[PDB]
Amino acid sequence: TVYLQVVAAGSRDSGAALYVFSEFNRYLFNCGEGVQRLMQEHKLKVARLDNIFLTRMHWSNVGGLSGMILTLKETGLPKCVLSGPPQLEKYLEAIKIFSGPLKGIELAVRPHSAPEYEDETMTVYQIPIHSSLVVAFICKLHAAFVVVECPDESFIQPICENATFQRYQGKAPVALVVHMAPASVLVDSRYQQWMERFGPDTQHLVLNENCASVHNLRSHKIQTQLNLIHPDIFPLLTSLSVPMVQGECLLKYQLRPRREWQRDAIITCNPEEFIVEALQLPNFQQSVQEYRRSAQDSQYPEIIFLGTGSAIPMKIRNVSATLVNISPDTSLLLDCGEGTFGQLCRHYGDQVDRVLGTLAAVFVSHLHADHHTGLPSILLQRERALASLGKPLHPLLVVAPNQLKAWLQQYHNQCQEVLHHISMIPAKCLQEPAVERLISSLLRTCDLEEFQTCLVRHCKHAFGCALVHTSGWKVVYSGDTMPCEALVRMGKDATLLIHEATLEDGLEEEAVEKTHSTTSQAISVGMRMNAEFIMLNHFSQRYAKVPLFSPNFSEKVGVAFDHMKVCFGDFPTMPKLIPPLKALFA
Ligand SMILES: [Zn+2]
Ligand SMILES: [Zn+2]
Numbered sequence: 001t002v003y004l005q006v007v008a009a010g011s012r013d014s015g016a017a018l019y020v021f022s023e024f025n026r027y028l029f030n031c032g033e034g035v036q037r038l039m040q041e042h043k044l045k046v047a048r049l050d051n052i053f054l055t056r057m058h059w060s061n062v063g064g065l066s067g068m069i070l071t072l073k074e075t076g077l078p079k080c081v082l083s084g085p086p087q088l089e090k091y092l093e094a095i096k097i098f099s100g101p102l103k104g105i106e107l108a109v110r111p112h113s114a115p116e117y118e119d120e121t122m123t124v125y126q127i128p129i130h131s132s133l134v135v136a137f138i139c140k141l142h143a144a145f146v147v148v149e150c151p152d153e154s155f156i157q158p159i160c161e162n163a164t165f166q167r168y169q170g171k172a173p174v175a176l177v178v179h180m181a182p183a184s185v186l187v188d189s190r191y192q193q194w195m196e197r198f199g200p201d202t203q204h205l206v207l208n209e210n211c212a213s214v215h216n217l218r219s220h221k222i223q224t225q226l227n228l229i230h231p232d233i234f235p236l237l238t239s240l241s242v243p244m245v246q247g248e249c250l251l252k253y254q255l256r257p258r259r260e261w262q263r264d265a266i267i268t269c270n271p272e273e274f275i276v277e278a279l280q281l282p283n284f285q286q287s288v289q290e291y292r293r294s295a296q297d298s299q300y301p302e303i304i305f306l307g308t309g310s311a312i313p314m315k316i317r318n319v320s321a322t323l324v325n326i327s328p329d330t331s332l333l334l335d336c337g338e339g340t341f342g343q344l345c346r347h348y349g350d351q352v353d354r355v356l357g358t359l360a361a362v363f364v365s366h367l368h369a370d371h372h373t374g375l376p377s378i379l380l381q382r383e384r385a386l387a388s389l390g391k392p393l394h395p396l397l398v399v400a401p402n403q404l405k406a407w408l409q410q411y412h413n414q415c416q417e418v419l420h421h422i423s424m425i426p427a428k429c430l431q432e433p434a435v436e437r438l439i440s441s442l443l444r445t446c447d448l449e450e451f452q453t454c455l456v457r458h459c460k461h462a463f464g465c466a467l468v469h470t471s472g473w474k475v476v477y478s479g480d481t482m483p484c485e486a487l488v489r490m491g492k493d494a495t496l497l498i499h500e501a502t503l504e505d506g507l508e509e510e511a512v513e514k515t516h517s518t519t520s521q522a523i524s525v526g527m528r529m530n531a532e533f534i535m536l537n538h539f540s541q542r543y544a545k546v547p548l549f550s551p552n553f554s555e556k557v558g559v560a561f562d563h564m565k566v567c568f569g570d571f572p573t574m575p576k577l578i579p580p581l582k583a584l585f586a
Contacts, residue, residue, distance in 0.1 A: 001022060001023060001256065002021075002121075002141065002254075002255050002256060003020070003021065003252055003253055003254060003255075004020050004145075004252070005019045005020070005044075006019075006205075006247045006249065006250055006251050007019045007038050007044075007250065008032070008034075008035065008038060008215060008249075009207055009213055009215070009248055009249055010180060010209060010211045010247060011211050011212065011215070011239070012209055012352075013034075013239075013341070013342040014032065014035075014215065015030060015060040015061065015063075016030055016207040016247075017030045017031060017035050017064075018030065018178065020122075020145075022122075024121060025048060025050055025122075026046070026050070027050075027051050028049055028051070028068075029052075029137070030053075030054060030055055030056075030061045030149075030180070031054070031061075031062070031063075031064035031065055032059075032060045032063045032064050033063030033064055033341075033373075033374065033377055034342050035064035035068070036064050036071055037318070037339060038216075040315060041215075041217070042265065046071065048077070049077065049080060050079065050080060050081060051080070051081050051082075051083060052065075052068070052081070052082050052083070053083045053147075054082065054083065054084035054088070055084070055134055055135055055136070055137070055147070055180070056085070056133075056134050056135075056149055056151070057084075057085050057087050057088075057091070057133075057415045057416060058416065059376045059418075060377075062084075062091060062415070063338075063373075063376075063377065065091075065092075065095065066099055067312060067338060067373075069095075069099070069102070069105060070099075070312065070369070073104055074312075076104070077105065078105075078106070079105070079107065079108070080107050080108075082108070082109045082110065083109075083124070084112070084135060085112065086111040087414055087415060088109045089109040090410075090414040091411070091414055091415050092107075094407055094411055094414060097403075097406050098369070098403070098404075098407050099369060110126075112128040114126065121142055122139045122140065122141050123139060123141075124137055124138075124139050125137065125138045125140070127162065127164045127165075129158050129159055134149050134155060136148045136159070136162075138165070141255065141256070143174075143175040143255040143259070144168060144173065144174045144175060145174075145175070146168075146174055146177040147178045148178065149181070150181035151182070152185065156185060156191050160190055160194035168198075169198050170197060173201070174198050176202065176203060176259075177195060177198065178204075178205045178206075178207070179195075179206045179207070180207045183208045183209065186206065192240065192241070195242065196241050199242075200241070200242045203242075203243050203244075203245060204243070204244045204245070205244075205245055206244060206245070207246075208246070211247050211248070213239065213248055213249050214239055214249070214267060214269050215249050216267075216315075217269065218316065219316070219562070220269050221269075223562075224236065225275070225278040226561065226584070228275060228288065229291065229581070229584075230291070232565070233565045233570060234563070234564060235347070235565060237346050238346065238347075238350075239346065248266060250267075251263065252264050252265075278584070281584060281586060284580065284583040284584055287582075287583040290579065290580075291576055291579065294573075295576075298568070298569070299567045299569060300326070300327060301324075301325075301326055301469070301473055301568060302324075302325060302566060302567045302568075303324045303496075303565075304322070304323040304324075304563075304565050304566075305537070305560050305562060305563065305564045305565075306321035306322060306323055306343040307319050307320050307321035307322070307340065307343060308322075308537050308538060308539055308560050308561065308562055309370075309539060309544065310370065310500075310502055310538050310539060310540060311370065312541070313338075314541065314544050316544045316562065317539060317544050317561075317562050318337075318338075318562060319337035319339055319340075319370045319371075319373075319374075320335050320371065320537065320538050321333070321334070321335055321336065321337055321343065321374075322334045322477075322537070323344070324467075324475070325358065326446055326447065326448075330360055330445070330446055331359050332360060332362070332446065333361075333362045333363070333378070334362070334477055335364055335365055335479075336362050336364060336371070336373075336374050337369075337371050338369070338370070338374045340374040340377065340378060341374060341377040341378055343562075344356075347563055352385070353385045353388050353389070354385070354389070356378075356385040357382075357385050357389055357391075359382060359396060360396075360397065360442070360445045360446055361396070361398065361442055361446070362375065362378070362398045363398075363399045363400075363465055363477070364398070364399075364400045364404065365456075365462060365463055365464065365479035365480060366401060366459060366461060366480065367404060367461075372404060376418050379396060379418055379422065380418070383421060395422055395423040396421060397423050397425060397441070397442050397445075398422055398423070399426075399442075399451075400424065400425075400426075400427060401427055401461045401462075401463070402426050402427075402428065402461075403461060405424060425438055425439060427453050428453075430451055430452065430465075431452070431453035431463070432454065439451070446469075447469060447470050448467055448469055449470050450466075451465065451467060452465060452468075452490055452491060453465050454466075454486040454489070456481040457481045457484040457515060458481055458515040459515065462479060462481070463479060464476065464478045464479040464490065466491055468491075473495045473496075474493065474494040474495050474496075475494060475495060475496045475497070475498075476490060476491070476494045476529070476531070478498060480502070480515070480516065480538065481515075481517060482512075482516060483517060483521045483522075487529055488528055492531070493531075494529065494531040495531070495533070496532065496533050496535060496568070497526050497529060497531035497534050498535045498536075498537050498560075499517070499525060499526050499535070499537070500516065500517050500522060500537060500538035501522050501537070501538070501539055502516035502517055502539065503517065503518040503540055504540065504543075504547060505518050505548060506518075519547050519548065520550050522534075523536075523552050523553070523554070524552065526556070527552075531556070532571070533556055533558065534556050534558065536559055536560055537560045539560075545585040546581055546582050546584075549578075549582075555575050557575070558574045558575065561581075
């Protein structure tokens with residue numbers, strides 16, 4: 001028995017990706033960014049992913065590796081094999097710069113030069129195609145598959161003229177064909193003469209950017225339930241001669257018994273059912289009523305919590321990210337971990353082409369897979385956004401540790417040119433004139449009076465930052481630290497402060513043995529800093545629910561959640577949301 005599934009249908013927020021599995025082995029195609037988030041919400045059976053097949057060197061195709069290697073490291077999968085362009089493995093020697101030279105997992109890379117494979121089923125054949133190089137994969141069970149990627153119009157003529165597909169067209173039998181091509185090039189005129197020759201008995205699956213659907217379900221559920229409390233700070237999310245069907249979430253297929261689709265576990269959203277389920281929790285409705293009665297008691301500088309999790313994400317909190325915007329047309333992103341662009345898109349919708357046009361700089365605290373992975377996704381999409389608005393490309397300033405430049409240089413030299421979108425400021429120069437003038441540009445582009453940095457605790461070369469505006473409001477971002485005096489010394493009297501509750505109280509021994517902070521320690525550090533408001537972020541990977549309360553939870557403390565919005569005028573009412581939230585996650 002063998003099936004097939006569509007992990008991602010190719011929406012704007014997530015690239016295309018396919019998942020094949022049987023009794024013996026399991027496979028994966030185009031492991032793009034955010035793929036590891038999926039396959040865990042849906043509870044798909046990993047633990048046997050011997051092979052990964054990649055159709056291009058672009059980031060949207062190869063972005064999910066760094067997380068999938070670690071996921072396989074968990075559960076101890078002995079080996080994995082990559083297949084794709086010859087430029088692989090040089091991408092991989094670049095990942096080891098920041099991912100740490102892990103030796104528990106041994107892996108191999110197969111270039112396009114290997115034609116046969118032939119291992120225990122389905123006998124992958126690799127088919128290189130040039131325009132500048134893509135590889136198409138066709139598989140033959142001991143039925144047949146076809147998986148093709150056609151990013152541009154220039155690939156149509158090579159694709160339709162290849163001789164490899166001609167011994168399966170007409171009469172072999174190719175059960176399916178999967179296309180991942182933009183809607184613009186899907187029709188052409190030379191095209192549709194190639195997918196025709198397979199005969200109408202075959203069905204074609206397409207994963208264009210027009211594949212509108214929701215791949216998460218649970219995030220939307222929790223967000224609507226939260227919006228039940230107070231809508232302003234919890235906005236709702238937003239998303240031929242032969243037969244042809246458009247791709248959806250997972251879906252399903254069968255090849256041997258009969259070639260039939262199956263909607264066994266498609267995902268659907270039912271806001272009203274979510275609301276009625278929510279209203280049955282113990283004392284949730286009463287708490288919301290009390291809060292609404294209590295509510296009877298500027299908006300420009302605001303912060304959006306795109307991500308608040310730690311370690312590999314777990315379907316409720318994504319890897320840490322936080323957007324700070326000083327005006328409707330000037331912004332700043334802070335940490336840029338994995339999945340940032342997906343969160344931004346699923347938060348704003350069609351305004352992303354304008355929000356990306358306001359970014360002025362980014363700030364990565366340190367080099368961990370949860371803090372800098374998603375930057376190239378922001379850069380590439382910012383390029384397109386600038387193109388759509390009819391303005392030239394202006395490099396996006398980035399403040400980062402000096403060790404980040406090595407990974408970017410390796411990627412630039414080995415996979416694709418991405419370095420020309422970036423202007424780098426070494427974070428060391430912003431703590432206690434070529435880079436000085438770039439610093440002046442950073443300060444002037446946001447009207448910030450000063451930008452400050454400090455070497456915080458945790459691993460080597462980890463930093464925090466403080467931002468102070470000409471209007472006088474001051475916000476300090478800690479990053480990952482254990483209670484240290486670098487904060488406070490960085491400048492007290494901050495209007496807002498963000499700190500990490502990576503652990504619950506009573507685990508100070510773990511907070512000492514490993515460099516992370518408990519909630520009580522975080523609140524203590526914030527109160528010593530004498531900040532007007534204290535905000536908790538970067539939560540523990542164990543629970544992902546509301547934290548544990550302690551006596552020191554003063555009026556100045558708050559609990560951050562994913563996709564949440566905040567303004568300086570919301571502080572007097574923010575502490576009053578605790579009861580209904582605690583009733584929600586009972
Ligand atoms: Zn780290
Ligand atoms: Zn961290």
